[PDB]
mmCIF file of C-alpha atoms in Angstrom:
data_model
loop_
_atom_site.group_PDB
_atom_site.id
_atom_site.type_symbol
_atom_site.label_atom_id
_atom_site.label_comp_id
_atom_site.label_asym_id
_atom_site.label_seq_id
_atom_site.Cartn_x
_atom_site.Cartn_y
_atom_site.Cartn_z
ATOM 1 C CA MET A 1 173.214 109.156 164.144
ATOM 2 C CA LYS A 2 172.508 107.519 160.690
ATOM 3 C CA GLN A 3 168.970 106.755 162.009
ATOM 4 C CA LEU A 4 167.997 110.560 162.614
ATOM 5 C CA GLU A 5 169.941 111.838 159.395
ATOM 6 C CA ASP A 6 167.428 109.229 157.397
ATOM 7 C CA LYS A 7 164.305 110.530 159.277
ATOM 8 C CA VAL A 8 165.593 114.390 158.189
ATOM 9 C CA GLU A 9 166.011 113.132 154.748
ATOM 10 C CA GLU A 10 162.286 111.717 155.184
ATOM 11 C CA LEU A 11 160.987 114.932 156.507
ATOM 12 C CA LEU A 12 162.404 116.599 153.669
ATOM 13 C CA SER A 13 160.837 114.960 151.013
ATOM 14 C CA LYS A 14 157.302 115.018 152.752
ATOM 15 C CA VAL A 15 157.687 118.790 153.645
ATOM 16 C CA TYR A 16 158.670 119.036 149.743
ATOM 17 C CA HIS A 17 155.081 117.052 149.123
ATOM 18 C CA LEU A 18 152.979 118.895 151.117
ATOM 19 C CA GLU A 19 154.563 122.431 149.680
ATOM 20 C CA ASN A 20 153.359 121.337 146.140
ATOM 21 C CA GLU A 21 150.019 120.120 147.710
ATOM 22 C CA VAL A 22 149.663 123.207 149.280
ATOM 23 C CA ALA A 23 150.472 125.420 146.433
ATOM 24 C CA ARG A 24 148.220 123.634 144.141
ATOM 25 C CA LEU A 25 145.409 124.355 146.591
ATOM 26 C CA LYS A 26 146.087 127.895 146.835
ATOM 27 C CA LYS A 27 145.999 128.105 142.936
ATOM 28 C CA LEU A 28 142.802 126.194 142.871
ATOM 29 C CA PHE A 29 140.989 128.010 145.793
ATOM 30 C CA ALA A 30 141.481 131.147 143.582
ATOM 31 C CA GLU A 31 139.218 130.264 140.957
ATOM 32 C CA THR A 32 136.447 129.000 143.334
ATOM 33 C CA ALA A 33 133.379 130.956 144.421
ATOM 34 C CA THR A 34 132.438 132.141 147.826
ATOM 35 C CA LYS A 35 129.112 131.315 149.439
ATOM 36 C CA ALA A 36 128.607 135.392 149.300
ATOM 37 C CA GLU A 37 128.960 136.088 145.966
ATOM 38 C CA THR A 38 127.099 133.154 144.692
ATOM 39 C CA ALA A 39 123.249 132.047 144.838
ATOM 40 C CA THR A 40 122.072 128.764 145.804
ATOM 41 C CA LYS A 41 119.850 126.450 143.735
ATOM 42 C CA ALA A 42 116.756 126.790 146.467
ATOM 43 C CA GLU A 43 116.773 130.595 145.917
ATOM 44 C CA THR A 44 117.430 131.142 142.301
ATOM 45 C CA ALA A 45 115.073 130.808 139.181
ATOM 46 C CA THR A 46 116.436 128.040 136.676
ATOM 47 C CA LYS A 47 115.591 128.423 132.924
ATOM 48 C CA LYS A 48 112.837 125.721 133.080
ATOM 49 C CA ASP A 49 110.969 127.829 135.782
ATOM 50 C CA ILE A 50 111.184 130.893 133.412
ATOM 51 C CA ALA A 51 110.587 128.285 130.258
ATOM 52 C CA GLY A 52 106.514 129.253 130.455
ATOM 53 C CA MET A 53 107.058 132.780 130.867
ATOM 54 C CA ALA A 54 105.009 135.560 129.254
ATOM 55 C CA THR A 55 106.832 138.522 127.712
ATOM 56 C CA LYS A 56 106.361 141.926 127.833
ATOM 57 C CA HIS A 57 105.519 142.114 123.743
ATOM 58 C CA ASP A 58 102.608 138.945 124.253
ATOM 59 C CA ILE A 59 100.967 141.087 126.298
ATOM 60 C CA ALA A 60 101.379 144.314 123.888
ATOM 61 C CA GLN A 61 99.760 141.907 121.517
ATOM 62 C CA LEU A 62 96.862 141.644 123.433
ATOM 63 C CA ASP A 63 96.787 145.520 124.688
ATOM 64 C CA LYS A 64 96.660 146.143 120.838
ATOM 65 C CA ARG A 65 93.884 143.679 120.157
ATOM 66 C CA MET A 66 91.981 144.994 122.881
ATOM 67 C CA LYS A 67 92.085 148.717 121.839
ATOM 68 C CA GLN A 68 90.842 147.583 118.583
ATOM 69 C CA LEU A 69 87.719 145.736 120.458
ATOM 70 C CA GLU A 70 87.206 148.893 122.325
ATOM 71 C CA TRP A 71 86.881 151.312 119.223
ATOM 72 C CA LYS A 72 84.931 148.900 117.503
ATOM 73 C CA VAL A 73 82.832 148.738 120.383
ATOM 74 C CA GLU A 74 82.616 152.415 121.300
ATOM 75 C CA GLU A 75 81.522 152.743 117.306
ATOM 76 C CA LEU A 76 78.591 149.796 118.053
ATOM 77 C CA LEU A 77 77.450 152.124 120.907
ATOM 78 C CA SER A 78 77.223 155.076 118.698
ATOM 79 C CA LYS A 79 75.433 153.385 115.768
ATOM 80 C CA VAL A 80 73.301 151.711 118.012
ATOM 81 C CA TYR A 81 71.834 154.797 119.795
ATOM 82 C CA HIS A 82 71.539 156.442 116.707
ATOM 83 C CA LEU A 83 69.263 153.536 115.160
ATOM 84 C CA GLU A 84 67.146 153.679 118.392
ATOM 85 C CA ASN A 85 66.386 157.587 117.873
ATOM 86 C CA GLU A 86 66.015 156.642 113.924
ATOM 87 C CA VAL A 87 63.431 153.561 114.986
ATOM 88 C CA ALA A 88 61.443 155.655 117.467
ATOM 89 C CA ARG A 89 61.129 158.522 115.007
ATOM 90 C CA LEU A 90 59.659 156.131 112.729
ATOM 91 C CA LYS A 91 57.086 155.066 115.193
ATOM 92 C CA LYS A 92 55.962 158.517 115.680
ATOM 93 C CA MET B 1 176.035 116.962 163.203
ATOM 94 C CA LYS B 2 176.070 120.905 162.750
ATOM 95 C CA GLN B 3 174.273 119.942 159.241
ATOM 96 C CA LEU B 4 171.685 118.233 160.607
ATOM 97 C CA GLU B 5 171.049 120.688 163.105
ATOM 98 C CA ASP B 6 170.614 123.698 160.736
ATOM 99 C CA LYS B 7 168.340 121.120 158.228
ATOM 100 C CA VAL B 8 166.241 120.483 161.288
ATOM 101 C CA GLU B 9 165.889 124.395 161.957
ATOM 102 C CA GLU B 10 164.842 124.657 158.170
ATOM 103 C CA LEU B 11 162.299 122.014 158.336
ATOM 104 C CA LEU B 12 160.550 123.870 161.666
ATOM 105 C CA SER B 13 160.079 127.204 159.898
ATOM 106 C CA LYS B 14 158.864 125.132 156.737
ATOM 107 C CA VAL B 15 156.674 123.219 158.760
ATOM 108 C CA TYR B 16 155.343 126.309 160.569
ATOM 109 C CA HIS B 17 154.801 128.086 157.346
ATOM 110 C CA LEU B 18 152.745 125.034 155.856
ATOM 111 C CA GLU B 19 150.686 125.503 159.511
ATOM 112 C CA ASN B 20 149.692 129.026 158.764
ATOM 113 C CA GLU B 21 148.881 128.418 155.002
ATOM 114 C CA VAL B 22 146.943 125.083 155.471
ATOM 115 C CA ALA B 23 144.928 127.103 158.536
ATOM 116 C CA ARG B 24 144.300 129.999 156.194
ATOM 117 C CA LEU B 25 142.952 127.322 153.433
ATOM 118 C CA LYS B 26 140.625 125.820 156.062
ATOM 119 C CA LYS B 27 139.539 129.428 156.822
ATOM 120 C CA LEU B 28 138.996 130.223 153.426
ATOM 121 C CA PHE B 29 137.039 127.084 152.206
ATOM 122 C CA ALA B 30 134.612 127.922 155.197
ATOM 123 C CA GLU B 31 133.092 130.712 153.236
ATOM 124 C CA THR B 32 133.373 128.999 149.970
ATOM 125 C CA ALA B 33 130.052 127.566 148.131
ATOM 126 C CA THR B 34 129.742 123.825 147.427
ATOM 127 C CA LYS B 35 128.612 122.681 143.861
ATOM 128 C CA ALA B 36 125.681 121.031 145.259
ATOM 129 C CA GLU B 37 123.977 123.939 147.075
ATOM 130 C CA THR B 38 125.123 126.854 144.375
ATOM 131 C CA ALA B 39 123.210 127.449 140.911
ATOM 132 C CA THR B 40 125.347 126.873 137.572
ATOM 133 C CA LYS B 41 124.853 129.895 135.070
ATOM 134 C CA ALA B 42 123.856 127.717 132.250
ATOM 135 C CA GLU B 43 120.498 126.341 134.331
ATOM 136 C CA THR B 44 119.804 130.117 135.863
ATOM 137 C CA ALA B 45 118.036 132.698 134.493
ATOM 138 C CA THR B 46 119.475 136.014 134.775
ATOM 139 C CA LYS B 47 117.958 139.375 135.240
ATOM 140 C CA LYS B 48 118.567 140.419 131.568
ATOM 141 C CA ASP B 49 116.360 137.029 130.778
ATOM 142 C CA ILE B 50 113.361 138.192 133.226
ATOM 143 C CA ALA B 51 113.796 142.075 131.992
ATOM 144 C CA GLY B 52 110.904 141.584 129.576
ATOM 145 C CA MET B 53 108.863 139.332 131.978
ATOM 146 C CA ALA B 54 105.072 140.164 132.056
ATOM 147 C CA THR B 55 103.672 140.584 135.776
ATOM 148 C CA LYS B 56 100.361 139.207 137.340
ATOM 149 C CA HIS B 57 98.893 142.517 137.624
ATOM 150 C CA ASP B 58 99.698 143.308 133.777
ATOM 151 C CA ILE B 59 97.226 140.239 133.202
ATOM 152 C CA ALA B 60 95.079 141.616 135.872
ATOM 153 C CA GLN B 61 94.858 144.855 133.845
ATOM 154 C CA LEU B 62 93.914 142.932 130.822
ATOM 155 C CA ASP B 63 91.616 140.913 132.730
ATOM 156 C CA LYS B 64 89.650 144.030 134.038
ATOM 157 C CA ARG B 65 89.430 145.623 130.621
ATOM 158 C CA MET B 66 88.173 142.353 128.895
ATOM 159 C CA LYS B 67 85.418 141.888 132.109
ATOM 160 C CA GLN B 68 84.280 145.605 130.898
ATOM 161 C CA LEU B 69 84.201 144.987 127.066
ATOM 162 C CA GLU B 70 82.068 141.658 128.106
ATOM 163 C CA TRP B 71 79.611 143.845 130.037
ATOM 164 C CA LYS B 72 79.208 146.325 127.438
ATOM 165 C CA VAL B 73 78.842 143.262 124.212
ATOM 166 C CA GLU B 74 76.282 141.769 126.373
ATOM 167 C CA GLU B 75 74.353 145.318 126.826
ATOM 168 C CA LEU B 76 74.962 145.602 123.016
ATOM 169 C CA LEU B 77 73.343 142.578 122.416
ATOM 170 C CA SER B 78 70.427 143.489 124.056
ATOM 171 C CA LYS B 79 69.881 146.281 122.356
ATOM 172 C CA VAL B 80 70.418 144.895 119.127
ATOM 173 C CA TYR B 81 68.116 141.943 119.573
ATOM 174 C CA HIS B 82 65.375 144.348 120.522
ATOM 175 C CA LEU B 83 65.825 146.752 117.631
ATOM 176 C CA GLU B 84 65.466 143.613 115.002
ATOM 177 C CA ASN B 85 62.306 142.948 116.689
ATOM 178 C CA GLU B 86 61.123 146.422 116.495
ATOM 179 C CA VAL B 87 61.876 146.804 112.815
ATOM 180 C CA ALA B 88 60.659 143.323 112.033
ATOM 181 C CA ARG B 89 57.318 144.768 113.410
ATOM 182 C CA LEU B 90 57.616 147.622 111.556
ATOM 183 C CA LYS B 91 58.232 145.799 108.360
ATOM 184 C CA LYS B 92 54.638 143.988 108.492
ATOM 185 C CA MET C 1 171.622 114.777 170.390
ATOM 186 C CA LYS C 2 168.532 113.705 172.549
ATOM 187 C CA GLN C 3 167.392 117.453 172.018
ATOM 188 C CA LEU C 4 167.418 117.166 168.231
ATOM 189 C CA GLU C 5 165.777 113.467 168.415
ATOM 190 C CA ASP C 6 162.413 115.026 170.042
ATOM 191 C CA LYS C 7 162.147 118.035 167.670
ATOM 192 C CA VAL C 8 162.535 115.259 164.731
ATOM 193 C CA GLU C 9 159.692 113.667 166.485
ATOM 194 C CA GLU C 10 157.956 116.463 167.510
ATOM 195 C CA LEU C 11 158.249 117.352 163.598
ATOM 196 C CA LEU C 12 157.103 113.837 162.586
ATOM 197 C CA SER C 13 153.828 114.357 164.105
ATOM 198 C CA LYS C 14 153.228 117.927 162.842
ATOM 199 C CA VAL C 15 153.705 116.636 158.915
ATOM 200 C CA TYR C 16 151.574 113.679 159.594
ATOM 201 C CA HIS C 17 148.679 115.758 160.767
ATOM 202 C CA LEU C 18 149.244 118.007 158.190
ATOM 203 C CA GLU C 19 149.271 115.070 155.294
ATOM 204 C CA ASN C 20 145.913 114.648 156.740
ATOM 205 C CA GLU C 21 144.716 118.168 156.779
ATOM 206 C CA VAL C 22 145.668 118.801 152.827
ATOM 207 C CA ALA C 23 143.853 115.254 151.983
ATOM 208 C CA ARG C 24 140.803 116.492 153.369
ATOM 209 C CA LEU C 25 141.196 119.886 151.628
ATOM 210 C CA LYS C 26 142.246 118.094 148.359
ATOM 211 C CA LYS C 27 138.763 115.832 148.814
ATOM 212 C CA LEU C 28 136.698 118.915 149.920
ATOM 213 C CA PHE C 29 137.643 121.000 147.144
ATOM 214 C CA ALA C 30 136.353 118.349 144.670
ATOM 215 C CA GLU C 31 133.032 119.479 145.873
ATOM 216 C CA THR C 32 133.196 123.244 145.594
ATOM 217 C CA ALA C 33 131.935 125.172 142.825
ATOM 218 C CA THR C 34 133.875 127.454 140.446
ATOM 219 C CA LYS C 35 133.358 131.445 139.895
ATOM 220 C CA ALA C 36 133.204 130.429 136.240
ATOM 221 C CA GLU C 37 130.668 128.010 136.245
ATOM 222 C CA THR C 38 128.572 129.611 139.200
ATOM 223 C CA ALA C 39 126.036 132.524 138.751
ATOM 224 C CA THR C 40 126.643 135.367 141.079
ATOM 225 C CA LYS C 41 123.678 137.154 143.058
ATOM 226 C CA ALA C 42 123.665 140.222 141.404
ATOM 227 C CA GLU C 43 123.314 138.557 138.061
ATOM 228 C CA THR C 44 120.433 135.769 138.582
ATOM 229 C CA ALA C 45 116.844 136.361 138.942
ATOM 230 C CA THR C 46 115.644 135.137 142.364
ATOM 231 C CA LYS C 47 112.415 133.084 142.879
ATOM 232 C CA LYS C 48 111.092 135.992 144.610
ATOM 233 C CA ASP C 49 111.741 138.281 141.434
ATOM 234 C CA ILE C 50 109.371 135.527 139.327
ATOM 235 C CA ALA C 51 106.958 135.218 142.172
ATOM 236 C CA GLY C 52 104.768 137.672 139.647
ATOM 237 C CA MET C 53 105.459 135.808 136.423
ATOM 238 C CA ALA C 54 102.925 135.572 133.726
ATOM 239 C CA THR C 55 102.710 132.216 132.507
ATOM 240 C CA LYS C 56 102.099 131.614 128.534
ATOM 241 C CA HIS C 57 99.124 129.615 129.816
ATOM 242 C CA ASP C 58 97.553 133.013 131.829
ATOM 243 C CA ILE C 59 98.120 134.344 127.826
ATOM 244 C CA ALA C 60 96.462 131.518 126.388
ATOM 245 C CA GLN C 61 93.557 132.094 128.365
ATOM 246 C CA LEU C 62 93.398 135.805 127.651
ATOM 247 C CA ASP C 63 93.507 134.953 123.894
ATOM 248 C CA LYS C 64 90.925 132.469 124.226
ATOM 249 C CA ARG C 65 88.154 135.144 125.692
ATOM 250 C CA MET C 66 89.879 138.006 123.526
ATOM 251 C CA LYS C 67 88.877 135.437 120.355
ATOM 252 C CA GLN C 68 85.233 135.094 121.949
ATOM 253 C CA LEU C 69 84.757 138.608 122.341
ATOM 254 C CA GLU C 70 86.194 139.522 118.490
ATOM 255 C CA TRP C 71 84.008 137.065 117.091
ATOM 256 C CA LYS C 72 80.655 138.473 118.835
ATOM 257 C CA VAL C 73 81.758 142.251 118.017
ATOM 258 C CA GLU C 74 82.118 140.853 113.998
ATOM 259 C CA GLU C 75 78.510 139.763 114.561
ATOM 260 C CA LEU C 76 77.211 142.712 116.183
ATOM 261 C CA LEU C 77 79.116 144.784 113.140
ATOM 262 C CA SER C 78 77.209 142.654 110.748
ATOM 263 C CA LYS C 79 73.650 142.891 112.890
ATOM 264 C CA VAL C 80 74.128 146.670 112.829
ATOM 265 C CA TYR C 81 75.074 147.036 109.138
ATOM 266 C CA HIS C 82 71.973 145.101 107.899
ATOM 267 C CA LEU C 83 69.641 146.892 110.069
ATOM 268 C CA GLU C 84 70.983 150.457 109.007
ATOM 269 C CA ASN C 85 70.012 149.323 105.467
ATOM 270 C CA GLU C 86 66.792 147.892 106.427
ATOM 271 C CA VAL C 87 66.056 150.840 108.593
ATOM 272 C CA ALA C 88 66.917 153.228 105.339
ATOM 273 C CA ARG C 89 65.030 151.077 102.935
ATOM 274 C CA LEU C 90 61.800 151.912 105.401
ATOM 275 C CA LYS C 91 62.545 155.641 105.321
ATOM 276 C CA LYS C 92 62.872 155.681 101.520
ATOM 277 C CA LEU C 93 59.741 153.519 100.619
#
């Protein structure tokens, strides 16, 4: 009977330890992220991958310059056409 | 003996609870994501970071326009070279 | 008493199993990721989203070409201005 009495005492401590350990795990699991809600390394773009990313302002800077050239080229077409007539007129 | 009998009954319920609690944690852990497979907030680019991203079609749009200008500039070179000769011829 | 003796034996094995099961979970939790440190699917850009990303070298390539055109257009302006004076001069004298 004293053998059984001790066993019970051993079980009590063991159960008590388990209770504590499970409680911890309960708390700790609260802070963990689910597979559903989180994104994998394989399917996500790192900050490394976008280090050499072009902005919409870089492109805007180029658009600006393109427009300026486009405008200058139009003016030149106008000037050249006029000169062709002027030279033609001179030849007659 | 009735004291020990009750203790055993108390342990039984406690063990039963723990069994359930651990099973839950087993299940719940199944849906959690590992550190290895998931990507950290620090090393991943958010949708905010890529809000002002330039596309390859923005650039294609610019390339198109560049090619058009390139053609117009060639034509102009041709027209101007001819005019220079025509004017030179007129001066002699 | 032998009924109680057996119950205790049943509890011992069950406790022993639980001890092992909890230890595993302890270990396994060590390799799991926290909500704080990880990034959600909703707030992160996938490799799909950046498949059509423009580089800074693409842009550099365009800048190079733009500069070449810019130079040619300046030269043309110069050539045309000179011709206008030359033709004007021809019309007067």
